[PDB]
Each structure stands twice: as structure tokens, then as C-alpha cells.
Design a protein around this ligand. Structure first.
Ligand code: HEA
Ligand code: HEA
Ligand SMILES: CCCCCCCCCCC(=O)OC[C@H](COP(=O)(O)OC[C@H](O)COP(=O)(O)OC[C@@H](COC(=O)CC)OC(=O)CCC)OC(=O)CCCCCCCC
Ligand SMILES: CCCCCCCCCCCCCCCC(=O)OC[C@H](COP(=O)([O-])OCC[N+](C)(C)C)OC(=O)CCCCCCCCCCCCCCC
Ligand SMILES: CCCCCCCCCCCCCCCC(=O)OC[C@H](COP(=O)([O-])OCC[N+](C)(C)C)OC(=O)CCCCCCCCCCCCCCC
Ligand SMILES: CCCCCCCCCCCCCCCCCCCC(=O)O[C@H](COC(=O)CCCCCCCCCCCCCC)COP(=O)(O)OCCN
Ligand SMILES: CCCCCCCCCCCCCCCCCCCC(=O)O[C@H](COC(=O)CCCCCCCCCCCCCC)COP(=O)(O)OCCN
Ligand SMILES: CCCCCCCCCCCCCCCCCCCC(=O)O[C@H](COC(=O)CCCCCCCCCCCCCC)COP(=O)(O)OCCN
Ligand SMILES: CCCCCCCCCCCCCCCCCCCC(=O)O[C@H](COC(=O)CCCCCCCCCCCCCC)COP(=O)(O)OCCN
Ligand SMILES: [Cu+2]
Lengths: 59, 38, 53, 55, 99, 128, 51, 530
């Protein structure tokens, strides 16, 4: 179809072959936001809460 | 009695601040589209 | 006097599972408020093409 | 035969090791003649190769 | 391994300290573990500082004890427990000194 | 004993103290520590903690106190000198495409509306 | 460099004691490396009609 | 000096060229991104040539002349002699040809543009595009030779590292106890050895099909161009797993130094680091899913290149375990190594989305790929190169680098290159193709967003030149005032300040126990370990 200025998603699905991709691009990115949701959280609990820990648990 | 209210107060303004990072680190194209649609 | 142990163990289990609970409130909205919102429009328009008989 | 003989010359020579052979004076000045030409003439044809002037 | 094998091992190593170095390098790894040290072993962490004639490595005990106590309620009961051997040696704390 | 006018305010005085005197005071203090404690006076007691566990040389912070703002004033003045340098290379730029000036963009919409290009979604195609 | 492990003597530069200031010979190594595509955008446009 | 065979002074020549090829490799990317600022050819007048020349001119300076000679040459010829316990490399005379063919690999490439044609073939130099009927002049003739000089330097530059690690260690340095930067390059040296002779046949056959007309690849004769798509990419995926394994060595040293703690699972980190190198061989046609492979061949690769995400998860979750308990000293190598742990892993999630054969068929050659491989090249192999320079600059040069000025160079790289490479995922999910000087008008949205950022990152690089000027001129007047950080490990809580200056460097490697700068003979006695 036609691309849209300042767009961020797929072009409009006009094929079941194309319609399968949109339900697999979202099936993948649902399991990519748990991993990005973990890493973005497990890196803010370390840089903030453990930069003020002067006794390093080195064992 | 210790980790029921001291483990909370360390974490309530943390997730109040952590979401403010991802709305700037990842949500920043939701402002340049908002500002100038022309 | 109290043999207090497990200050890091109580800050890993509390630390991991509140990221999985934070990996859901960004992902279950993305699959419902965006993905099911996008399948709402395509189920609507294709039902407005089968109306023409 | 010359292995002990050269070992007197090579050890405690106080020379660069590529000047430490007795049969090495003639090995360099013809070699520095073919080295002084093979690194300019592939490069001097490069302004000849910019204007389409080929052969 | 356990809480008691933690206590018996580091209350033993404080006796053969003999120096300022082998107090601070042993007071360090008596505080750099997952758990919290008993007041039995920290009594030999003040007697070790008295054997080496150094006071700020006995004021730094109670400041390392303050951050790694995980509860203020579990600190004042822990502070009043040590007040029997903290008034003999005359060790102040960092908040009372106001440096 | 040790006099008051040598350990009075050993916070602002430890640095910019001459180095031969700077380890003379730790020599006098190391002999006052071979005593029963709680007989050292408080300017002599709080100023042996500053020598062993203060903030000077080692245990100096990675950033100074007036230095975290100098970081955030080089970032926010690097984005300004970036965009301000972007305009000079754009004003020294070639002539743009003819298909962008809001009226080519307008008539390329009912061309798509008469063909139903993006039914659900937007085919606006308008960004002058 | 074979010997003299000093402070400036493991680098083939000549930092101190140079006749000319070093910012001439330091920016003049890194801006020259910046200006090599701007002569590939010169002799390939002027050859191919553009300017 | 020019032809001194000391391995220390060769690696300072490696690093002296990887910025000169860097400031040429990013000045080309400046003009590339300046042309994608607006529709219509703005600065290039109407020339769609010299844009497939600048793209190949930029993408090979970044891969083969920046990240290859720095993470393997600029560091591996300085640290693998030093950390293991050698005096220099095992083959020190061929150690000098491995550098001095690299400027000769530059004269074979800058003159490949100045000649009348210009090699407009792209980085993946494809056979019928680069055939003699398509590309006529001597432009692509030199572009397939400068790729050969670097193929032969970094090949004998890895034979130099298998017979250095295997026999030239110290007394107690057993095979299970090495620094992880050595196990990075020694594992890398078993990929540089077993992928570059595959490449050297895949380029010389293209030379034979261009002036000796042998038809390995010519269609008139049955020679496939699709043989090239599995023979070049058999080199290609191990090549991009060579720009990241020394990147996995520097980060494992920095993140466990600026946290006062040994690294989590060191024996677990060396077995999941060759398994990346071994299993990276068996996945080489995931780039070419759409080129017409079989329905079971693509079914194998869509399950096999996801298993590369099995040991990389071990090598990331352990870096989120080696800083959990310990302290954090946020200096400049710790800032890069902690933003490497967020932007490389987001370049990994886009990896497993592209890894499927059922989803690459709507993503190949788009800008969603360029959004993915720049989060793992300019953010996974520059974030570990800036975290390796700043981690060993005053230890090796002897001069400190104005720490208050290296923090603003980090943030202008972080947010001034995330603004470029994050909107690339949006232009590619619509379907903007690659290597194009102009585009449809709907792709002018983010291509002006990604154009404002290339002046931000290349203003930080102009600042990084000034840090290199402040480090060489009055870099001695930095550690005597409060400009820089001197001790990279602050002492413990109960470690007194007057006892710290006796036992200063509590390192786990020899690299800091040496002098600053190290001696010309820093090992004249066989050192002992444990
Ligand atoms: C090592 C790999 C590498 C690196 C770092 C970069 C860095 C950059 N690249 Fe490039 N690029 C490629 C490899 C790389 N690229 C490849 C393989 C292609 C595809 C070509 C093809 O297939 O057609 C490509 C293509 C490519 C395109 C075309 C897309 C397409 O057609 O496929 C564009 C345009 O936006 C682009 C831009 C940039 C930008 C803005 C940077 C910025 O990051 C650069 C500015 C940032 C810096 C300031 C940091 C780097 C500067 C240094 C000097 C390094 C520092 C190190 C030392 C000094 C210690 N690149
Ligand atoms: C330089 C570094 C580098 C690295 C490390 C990678 C790593 C990976 N790459 Fe990429 N890739 C390139 C650079 C790199 N790539 C380049 C230059 C190209 C081609 C561009 C060109 O042709 O011009 C390319 C191309 C490319 C393609 C081809 C697309 C196309 O051209 O059509 C594909 C698709 O399969 C792909 C996939 C992957 C995968 C799956 C990984 C995986 O190794 C990454 C896995 C990492 C993680 C997933 C994150 C960490 C792990 C976790 C936190 C836990 C596990 C994760 C979950 C359970 C989800 N890459
Ligand atoms: C091809 C190669 C090209 C290379 C060109 C790159 C140019 C980059 C130059 C960067 C630079 O040199 O800055 C370092 C310099 C010295 O700093 P220092 O580390 O010794 O510590 C100082 C002290 O700790 C705090 O300094 P103080 O806080 O007292 O000064 C305020 C200062 C802060 O504001 C800014 O940084 C942005 C303006 O403001 C000014 O001075 C305004 C004066 C007009 O700091 C300065 O004074 C910068 C002054 C402005 C220079 C022009 C800026 C252009 C963007
Ligand atoms: C995050 C770190 C900093 C990010 C900086 C992003 C820069 C965005 C930018 O430059 O966008 C410019 C747009 C263009 O607007 P346009 O709709 O294309 O109008 C045409 C203007 N031309 C192209 C003719 C010049 O114009 C705009 O939208 C201007 C709005 C400025 C938005 C500032 C940053 C957004 C918030 C980030 C937090
Ligand atoms: C000082 C001179 C100011 C000039 C006036 C101005 O605003 O100019 C807009 C410029 C040029 O934008 P342009 O439309 O590409 O202009 C060139 C057009 N040619 C000649 C190529 C056909 O565009 C720009 O300078 C960039 C505008 C978009 C970015 C806005 C600022 C974002 C800052 C974010 C900070 C956070
Ligand atoms: C893992 C990370 C890899 C990168 C993933 C790349 C994006 C993946 C696709 C998710 C996109 C979701 C966008 C939804 C959307 O439609 O919002 C657009 C506007 O948002 C905006 O303009 C601001 C965009 C903010 C998106 C931030 C995405 C973060 C990733 C997870 C979310 C709509 O705009 P439109 O196209 O309808 O406008 C038409 C003008 N006529
Ligand atoms: C990073 C975390 C995601 C949010 C970052 C800020 C951008 C997202 C909000 C702004 C926005 O428009 O994105 C919405 C969806 O984003 C998302 O759902 C991202 C998922 C998280 C779509 O917003 P919209 O409802 O206007 O969609 C327009 C359809 N034409
Ligand atoms: C003052 C009047 C003289 C020009 C400056 C106006 C200040 C307001 C912003 C408009 C300036 C400007 O031309 O840049 C606009 C974009 O805004 C920006 O990029 C940010 C502008 C503020 C910084 C262009 O936008 P435009 O719609 O004015 O025209 C663009 C071509 N058609
Ligand atoms: C392919 C090049 C050869 C690969 C094998 C080289 C490593 C084994 C041979 C070897 O050890 O000698 C090298 C010299 O060869 C060379 O340097 C000759 C190779 C370069 C010329 C190739 C001419 C082909 C006709 C090392 O030399 P070294 O002096 O560092 O070893 C100091 C010994 N104690
Ligand atoms: Cu790949």
C-alpha cells in the first residue's frame, strides 16, 4: 500500500500470508518486552540502589 | 517486621522514577511526532 | 540479639519477580491495547466488505 | 663445515643481523635498486590513471 | 558455613592479629559477607583495635555496623547490647563526635 | 598532651598543610593512641578519624562537588552546538524536492481515497 | 622504540620540545583524516560533471 | 620508531591508525547521512554513484580498519603479551607485517575511489553487480584487494595468538585460570583461523571471473551468484562474532573492577564463550532466508540461530550478577560498560526477531536490519572500545584524561547515537530499502530525525580528539590537581587512608601492577602465580 509519514507499524495487511506476519511480529515482541522489561529494571536497581553500597559482597 | 516496610519505601519512588527513564529512552519519538505534524 | 541472615536473598527474589511483574505491565498492554486494538480495526473493515452482497 | 666458522662471525659481530653475513654486501645495493623503483612506478602512473590516459 | 561456624572462625582470627593491617583486612571480610555478624565476634573486633592502639578503626566498626544493620529497630537494641564493652574502651560513634 | 592550636579544625586544614608538618601531626597523634582512650580531647579525637577515614587523596569522590553540573552543561550545550551547526550545512544545501510543498501532498490523498489504500489506519501523506 | 621507557617515549609522536606547537601536528593528523572523503567527493564529482 | 619489532610499540601504531581510519570511516557516514536528510539529492548533486561508493567506503573502514585493528591489534598486541606473562608475542617479526600492510590496505582503498569509475558495489560485494560487464574500471579491482590485505593481516595476527597462549604462560597459570580478555581473543583466534581462508577463496574467485573470465559466478556458464551468498556469508557471520567476543572480554574486566568483586561464574563464562564461537559457524544463511532456500533448510536455521541466544544470555545475566552485591564506582569505563548492557541487549532482541525465516521475509534489506546491527556495532563494539581505551589509557600512556570531560563525551555518544539508530526500526518496518540516495516522500519523517543525530555523535568525536589533546599535552598536570580520577579502585569501608598507599592496586591482573607506562622489558624474570 502507501507508507505513511512518521509511522511506526506495518503497512496494511491485504494478504493472509501478510496477515500471518503481523500475528508473528506481535507474538515475538510480546516475549521481547518481558526480556526488555527485565533488563531495564535489573539495571536500574543496580546503578541506583547499589552505587551507595560501600561494603562489596565479594563472596 | 523489618522487610515489610523498609523494603517498600526503597522501591515505591524507584518504579515511579524507572518508568520516567523508559519514557525518555524509548518514548522520545512520541514527542517529535506530537510537536511537528505540519 | 537476633541471627539476622538473608538481606541479599530477600533482595533477589523481591528483585527478580517485580521485574517479571514489570515485564508484564508493559507487554500485556502492548498485546491488548495495541495488538488487539489493531486486530479490532481489521476485523471491522473486513466485516464491512462482506456486507456488500 | 662453515657452521662453526660462521658462528665465530655471527656471534659477537656488533652489526645488524642482515649485515652479518660475509656474502651480504652485494646482496643489498642491487636489492635497494629494485626496491627504489618498484614502489614509485606503480604509484607514479596513478595521476596517469586519473585522467583516463591508459595503455 | 552456618551462623555459628561464622562466629567461631572469625572470633579466632582476631586473636592472631598482631598488626594494624591484619585487623583491617580481617574486619573487612568479617563484614563483607551475605549475613550480619554476631555481637560475640564484634566484641573481638574492638579488642583487636585495642591491641593495635588505633581508635578510628574502632569508630569505623560502628559505622559499618550502621549501614549494614538493615533496620534501625535492630540497631538500637544492638547498640545498647554493646554498651558494656563500649564504655570501657571509650569508643565514640561518628554522630556523637560530629567531625 | 597536644595543643589546641594544631588540631583545631582539621577539616579545612588537612589539605594545604605543608607535608613535613602534615606527617608531624600524625606522629604526635600515634603516640597519644598508645594510651587508654577517652582521655584524648575531642579536637584530638575527631581529627584522627579525619586522617585515617576522611576524604582526601584516596576516598576522594570521582566527581567533585561542583562537577556534576559541569557534566550536564556539556551535554545540554553539545546538543545546542550540534543543531546550531546543522542549520549552517542545511542553509548551504541543494534545492529540495518539488513533491513536498503541501499541495502535491494534498492531491495525492483523494487519489488514494478513490482507491482505498489504507482503509483502517492513515493515508494522510501530508507533511509539508 | 627499543629503549628509554620514560613517559612520552613509547609514542612515535614528539609532544614536548617540538619547534612548532603540537595542536598543529595533532589536529593536523585527525582533520586530514577527516578531509579525505571530501576529496573523494571532489575529484569524482568534477570528473562526472558536477561541482 | 618505524620498524621496531617490540609488541608494545606495534600496538600503539595500531591505535594510531584506527582513529585515522576512524575519522575517515565516519566522515563518509557524515555525507551518507547528510544525503538522507531530505528527498532529492541535496549535496551530491544528482549522482547515485559516489553513494554506493561512499557506503562501501564507510562500511569497510568501520569493520576492517577500526574494530578489527583495535580490539584485536590495538589491544591484543598490547594486553596478551602483558596479562599472560610473556615479554612480547611468540612471533614478533611477523607482528610488524600485521600492522604495516594496513596502510597498504588503505592505499589499495582510497585510490579505489579516486579512479574514474568508483566501486558502487556495497559492502557485500555481489558477483553480477561487481562483474566486469557491470563494473568496468579498476575501481572494484582495488576494493577486492584491500579486503584481501586485511584478510591476511588478521589471519597471521591470530596464528600469533594460538602459540602464545598455549605455551608461553607463567608457572602457575594453568589452562583453567586466565584473564577473560585472553580467553576472548584465544577463542576469537580459532574463528579468525577457520573463516578467513573461506573468504580468501570467495574473493579471488570473483577476481578470476572479472579479468580471467573463468565463470565461477558468471550466469552465462552456469556459475551461480547464489554460491557467493553462502560462501561469503560463511565468513560473514563469524566475522560479526569476532567484533563482539573481544568486546565480551573488556566488559568482563571493567564491570568486575569498578565493582569490587570477581566476575560471576568465571568457569561458566569461558564455556559459554567458545559455544558462541563454535555454534556461530553452523548459522551462516540466516542472512539469505529469502534467496530461495528449501522449506526444511530454512526450518533448520530458524531454530539454529536462536540457540546463539542461549550462551549470550549466560554472558549477560552473569554481568547482571557480578554487580548485584558489590559496590559501583561510576567512572567513565563503568558508564560505557553499563550502557553496553542495555543497548547491546536491545540489539539482541531485534536479533531474534530477524532470526526467524517466517519473519525475515518482511524485513530483509530494509532499515530494520540497520537498526539492529548498529545497536551491536556502534553500541556493542564502540561501547567496549571506549570502555577499553578509558580503562587502560593512563596505565599505558602514563597520563590521565580529564575525567570531568570524558563524562560529557559518554552522554553525547549515548543519546546522540540512540537518536540515530532507534528510528531506523520505524523506517524499516514500513519497508524503506537500503543503500538508496533518495526515497519515497513518506520516509522523510524519521530520516530527518536520524540526520540531526549524526551531528551529535560526530561532535562528541570532535570532543574526543580534544581529550586526546588534553591527555598528551598537560596530561601530567591532571593527576596532580582535581581534574581526573587517579585510583580506579577506592578503598574499602574499614580500610584506612594511610594504609592504602602501601597496598594500592588490588588488581586481579598483571596489567595494573606494571608501571605507567610499562617498561621496554617489563618481563625479564619468569613471574609466578599461586
Ligand atoms: C563497525 C561497524 C560500523 C559502525 C561503527 C558504523 C557506524 C555508523 N554507521 Fe554504518 N554501516 C556499517 C557498519 C558500521 N557503521 C555497515 C556494515 C553498513 C552497511 C553497508 C551495506 O551493507 O550497504 C553500514 C551502513 C550504514 C548506513 C546505510 C544503511 C544501509 O544502506 O544499509 C548508514 C546510514 O545511516 C550508516 C550510518 C552510520 C552511523 C551514523 C554510524 C555512527 O555510529 C558513527 C558516528 C559515531 C561515532 C562518533 C563513533 C565511532 C567513531 C570512532 C572513531 C570510533 C571510536 C574508537 C576509537 C577512537 C577508540 N551506516
Ligand atoms: C557485530 C555484531 C552482531 C551481533 C552480535 C549479531 C548478533 C545477532 N544477529 Fe546479526 N547482524 C549483524 C551484526 C551482528 N549480529 C550484521 C552486520 C548483519 C548484516 C547486515 C548486512 O548484511 O549489511 C547482521 C544480520 C543479521 C540477520 C540478517 C537479516 C537480513 O539481512 O535479512 C539476522 C537474521 O537472522 C541476524 C540475527 C542475529 C542474531 C539472532 C544475533 C544473536 O547473536 C543475538 C542474540 C542476543 C540476545 C537475544 C540478547 C541477550 C540475551 C538475553 C537477554 C537472553 C536470551 C534472549 C531471549 C530468551 C529472548 N543478524
Ligand atoms: C577537529 C578537532 C576540533 C576540536 C574542537 C572541540 C572543542 C571542545 C572544547 C571543549 C573544552 O575545551 O572544554 C574544556 C574547558 C576546560 O574545562 P576544565 O576541564 O579545565 O574545568 C573547568 C572547571 O572545572 C569548571 O569551569 P566553570 O564552571 O568555572 O566555567 C563555566 C563554563 C561551563 O560552561 C560550559 O562548559 C559551556 C559553555 O562556561 C564557560 O567557561 C563559558 C566561557 C565562555 O572548559 C571550558 O572552559 C569550555 C569553554 C567553552 C569552549 C567552547 C565550547 C563550544 C561548545
Ligand atoms: C532525546 C534527546 C534529544 C532528541 C532530539 C530530537 C530532534 C528532533 C528533530 O530534529 O525533529 C525536527 C522536527 C521536524 O519537523 P517537521 O514536521 O519535519 O517540519 C519540517 C521541518 N524541516 C524538516 C523542514 C526542517 O521538528 C520537531 O518536531 C521539533 C520538536 C523538538 C522536539 C525536541 C525533542 C523531543 C523530546 C525529547 C525528550
Ligand atoms: C541560526 C539559523 C536559523 C535558521 C532558521 C531555521 O530554523 O532553519 C531551519 C533549519 C533548516 O531546515 P531545512 O528546511 O532543511 O533548510 C534547508 C532547506 N534547503 C536550503 C536545503 C532547501 O533546520 C534546522 O536548523 C533544524 C530544525 C529542526 C530541529 C529543531 C531543534 C531541535 C533541538 C532539540 C534539543 C533537545
Ligand atoms: C525491542 C526494541 C526494538 C525496536 C522496536 C521498534 C518498534 C516496534 C513496533 C512498535 C511500535 C508501536 C507504535 C504504535 C503506533 O502506531 O504509534 C504511532 C505513533 O507513535 C510515535 O510517533 C512515537 C513512537 C513511540 C514508539 C516507541 C516504541 C518502543 C518499543 C515498544 C513500544 C502511530 O503513528 P502513525 O503511524 O499512526 O502516524 C500516522 C501519521 N499520519
Ligand atoms: C517505551 C514504553 C512504551 C511507551 C513509550 C512512549 C511511546 C508510547 C506512547 C505514545 C504512543 O503514541 O505510543 C502508543 C503505543 O505505544 C506502546 O504501546 C508501547 C508499549 C510499551 C500509541 O499511541 P496511539 O494510541 O496514539 O496509537 C496511534 C495509532 N494510530
Ligand atoms: C523566529 C522567526 C525566524 C525563524 C525561526 C522561527 C522560530 C520558531 C521555529 C521556526 C523556525 C524554523 O524555520 O524551523 C522550523 C522547524 O522548527 C525547529 O526546527 C525548531 C525551531 C526552534 C529552535 C521550520 O518550520 P516552518 O513550518 O517554519 O517551515 C519550515 C520550512 N517549510
Ligand atoms: C603464510 C605465512 C607463513 C605462515 C606460517 C608462519 C609461522 C610459522 C613459520 C615461522 O615460524 O616463521 C615465521 C617467518 O615466516 C615469514 O615471516 C614468511 C611469511 C611472509 C612471506 C611469505 C612468502 C611466501 C612465498 C616467523 O618469523 P619470526 O622471525 O617472527 O620467528 C622467530 C622464530 N624464533
Ligand atoms: Cu548474521
Amino acid at each position: 500500500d502507501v507508507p505513511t509519514p512518521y509511522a511506526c507499524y506495518f503497512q496494511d495487511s491485504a494478504t493472509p500470508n501478510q496477515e500471518g506476519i503481523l500475528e508473528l511480529h506481535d507474538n515475538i515482541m510480546f516475549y521481547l518486552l518481558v526480556i526488555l522489561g527485565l533488563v531495564s529494571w535489573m539495571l536500574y536497581t543496580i546503578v541506583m540502589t547499589y552505587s551507595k553500597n560501600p561494603i562489596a559482597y565479594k563472596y | 517486621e523489618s522487610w515489610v516496610i523498609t523494603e517498600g519505601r526503597r522501591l515505591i519512588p524507584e518504579i515511579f522514577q524507572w518508568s520516567a527513564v523508559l519514557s525518555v529512552c524509548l518514548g522520545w519519538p512520541g514527542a517529535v511526532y506530537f510537536f511537528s505534524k505540519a | 540479639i537476633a541471627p539476622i541472615t538473608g538481606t541479599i536473598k530477600r533482595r533477589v527474589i523481591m528483585d527478580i519477580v517485580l521485574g517479571f511483574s514489570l515485564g508484564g505491565v508493559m507487554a500485556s498492554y502492548w498485546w491488548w491495547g495495541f495488538h488487539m486494538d489493531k486486530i479490532n480495526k481489521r476485523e471491522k473493515f473486513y466485516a464491512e466488505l462482506a456486507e456488500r452482497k | 663445515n662453515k657452521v662453526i666458522q660462521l658462528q665465530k662471525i655471527f656471534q659477537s659481530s656488533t652489526k645488524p643481523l642482515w649485515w652479518r653475513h660475509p656474502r651480504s654486501a652485494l646482496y643489498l645495493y642491487p636489492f635497494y635498486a629494485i626496491f627504489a623503483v618498484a614502489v614509485v612506478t606503480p604509484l607514479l602512473y596513478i595521476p596517469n590513471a586519473i585522467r583516463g590516459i591508459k595503455a | 558455613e552456618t551462623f555459628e561456624e561464622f562466629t567461631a572462625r572469625y572470633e579466632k582470627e582476631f586473636d592472631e592479629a598482631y598488626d594494624l593491617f591484619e585487623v583491617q583486612r580481617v574486619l573487612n571480610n568479617c563484614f563483607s559477607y551475605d549475613l550480619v555478624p554476631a555481637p560475640a565476634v564484634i566484641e573481638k573486633a574492638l579488642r583487636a583495635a585495642r591491641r593495635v592502639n588505633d581508635l578510628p578503626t574502632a569508630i569505623r566498626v560502628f559505622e559499618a555496623l550502621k549501614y549494614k544493620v538493615e533496620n534501625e529497630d535492630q540497631y538500637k537494641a544492638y547498640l545498647d547490647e554493646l554498651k558494656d564493652v563500649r564504655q570501657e574502651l571509650g569508643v565514640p560513634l561518628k554522630e556523637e563526635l560530629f567531625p | 598532651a597536644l595543643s589546641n592550636a594544631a588540631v583545631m579544625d582539621l577539616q579545612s586544614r588537612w589539605e594545604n598543610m605543608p607535608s613535613t608538618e602534615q606527617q608531624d601531626i600524625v606522629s604526635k597523634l600515634s603516640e597519644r593512641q598508645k594510651l587508654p582512650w577517652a582521655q584524648l580531647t575531642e579536637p584530638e579525637k575527631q581529627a584522627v578519624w579525619y586522617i585515617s577515614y576522611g576524604e582526601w587523596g584516596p576516598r576522594r569522590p570521582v566527581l567533585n562537588k561542583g562537577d556534576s553540573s559541569f557534566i550536564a552543561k556539556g551535554v545540554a550545550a553539545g546538543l545546542l552546538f550540534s543543531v546550531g551547526l546543522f542549520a549552517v550545512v542545511r542553509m548551504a544545501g541543494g534545492q529540495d524536492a518539488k513533491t513536498m510543498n503541501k499541495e502535491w501532498q494534498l492531491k495525492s490523498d483523494e487519489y488514494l481515497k478513490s482507491k482505498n489504500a489504507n482503509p483502517w489506519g492513515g493515508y494522510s501523506q501530508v507533511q509539508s | 622504540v627499543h629503549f628509554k621507557d620514560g613517559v612520552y617515549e613509547n609514542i612515535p609522536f614528539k609532544v614536548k620540545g617540538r619547534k612548532t606547537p603540537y595542536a598543529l601536528s595533532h589536529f593536523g593528523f585527525f582533520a586530514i583524516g577527516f578531509a579525505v572523503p571530501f576529496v573523494a567527493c571532489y575529484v569524482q564529482l568534477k570528473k562526472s560533471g558536477a561541482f | 620508531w618505524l620498524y621496531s619489532t617490540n609488541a608494545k610499540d606495534i600496538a600503539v601504531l595500531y591505535f594510531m591508525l584506527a582513529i585515522f581510519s576512524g575519522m575517515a570511516g565516519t566522515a563518509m557516514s557524515l555525507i551518507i547521512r547528510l544525503e538522507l536528510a531530505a528527498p532529492g539529492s541535496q549535496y551530491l548533486h544528482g549522482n547515485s554513484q559516489l553513494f554506493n561508493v561512499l557506503v562501501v567506503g564507510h562500511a569497510v573502514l568501520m569493520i576492517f580498519f577500526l574494530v578489527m585493528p583495535a580490539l584485536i591489534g590495538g589491544f591484543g598486541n598490547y594486553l596478551l603479551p602483558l596479562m599472560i606473562g610473556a615479554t612480547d608475542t611468540a612471533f614478533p617479526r611477523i607482528n610488524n607485517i600485521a600492522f604495516w600492510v594496513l596502510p597498504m590496505g588503505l592505499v589499495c582503498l582510497v585510490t579505489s575511489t579516486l579512479v574514474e569509475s568508483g566501486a558502487g558495489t556495497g559492502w557485500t560485494v555481489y558477483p553480477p553487480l561487481s562483474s566486469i560487464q557491470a563494473h568496468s574500471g579498476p575501481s572494484v579491482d582495488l576494493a577486492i584487494f584491500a579486503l584481501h590485505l586485511t584478510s591476511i593481516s588478521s589471519l597471521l595476527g591470530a596464528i600469533n595468538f594460538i602459540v602464545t597462549t598455549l605455551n608461553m604462560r607463567t608457572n602457575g597459570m594453568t589452562m583453567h585460570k586466565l584473564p577473560l580478555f585472553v580467553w576472548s581473543i584465544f577463542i576469537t583466534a580459532f574463528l579468525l583461523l577457520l573463516s578467513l581462508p573461506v573468504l580468501s577463496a570467495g574473493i579471488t574467485m570473483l577476481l578470476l571471473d572479472r579479468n580471467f573470465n573463468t565463470s565461477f559466478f558468471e550466469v552465462s556458464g552456469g556459475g551461480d551468484p547464489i554460491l557467493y551468498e553462502h560462501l561469503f556469508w560463511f565468513f560473514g557471520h563469524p566475522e560479526v562474532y569476532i567484533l563482539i567476543i573481544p568486546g565480551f572480554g573488556i566488559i568482563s574486566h571493567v564491570v568486575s573492577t569498578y565493582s569490587k568483586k570477581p566476575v560471576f561464574g568465571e568457569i561458566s563464562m569461558v564455556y559459554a564463550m567458545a559455544s558462541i564461537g563454535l555454534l556461530g559457524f553452523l548459522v551462516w544463511s540466516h542472512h539469505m532466508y529469502i534467496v530461495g532456500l528449501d522449506a526444511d533448510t530454512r526450518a533448520y536455521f530458524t531454530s539454529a540461530t536462536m540457540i546463539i541466544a542461549i550462551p549470550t544470555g549466560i554472558k549477560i545475566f552473569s554481568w547482571l550478577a557480578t554487580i548485584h552485591g558489590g559496590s559501583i564506582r561510576l567512572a567513565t569505563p563503568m558508564l560505557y560498560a553499563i550502557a553496553f548492557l542495555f543497548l547491546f541487549t536491545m540489539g539482541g532482541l531485534t536479533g531474534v526477531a530477524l532470526a526467524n525465516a517466517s519473519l525475515d521475509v518482511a524485513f530483509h534489506d530494509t532499515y530494520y536490519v540497520v537498526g539492529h546491527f548498529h545497536y551491536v556495532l556502534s553500541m556493542g563494539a564502540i561501547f567496549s572500545l571506549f570502555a577499553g581505551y578509558y580503562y587502560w589509557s593512563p596505565q599505558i600512556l602514563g597520563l590521565n584524561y580529564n575525567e570531568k570531560l570524558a563524562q560529557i563525551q559518554f552522554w553525547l555518544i549515548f543519546i546522540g547515537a540512540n537518536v540515530i539508530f532507534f528510528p531506523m526500526h520505524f523506517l524499516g518496518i514500513n519497508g524503506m530499502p537500503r543503500r538508496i540516495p533518495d526515497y519515497p516522500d513518506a520516509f522523510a519523517g524519521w530520516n530527518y530525525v536520524a540526520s540531526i543525530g549524526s551531528f551529535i555523535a560526530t561532535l562528541s568525536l570532535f570532543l574526543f580528539i580534544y581529550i586526546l589533546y588534553d591527555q598528551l599535552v598537560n596530561g601530567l598536570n591532571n593527576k596532580v590537581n582535581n581534574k581526573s580520577v587517579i585510583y580506579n579502585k577506592a578503598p574499602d569501608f574499614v580500610e584506612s587512608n594511610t594504609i592504602f598507599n602501601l597496598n594500592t592496586v588490588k588488581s586481579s591482573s598483571i596489567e595494573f601492577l606494571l608501571t605507567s607506562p610499562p617498561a621496554v622489558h617489563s618481563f625479564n624474570t619468569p613471574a609466578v602465580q599461586s
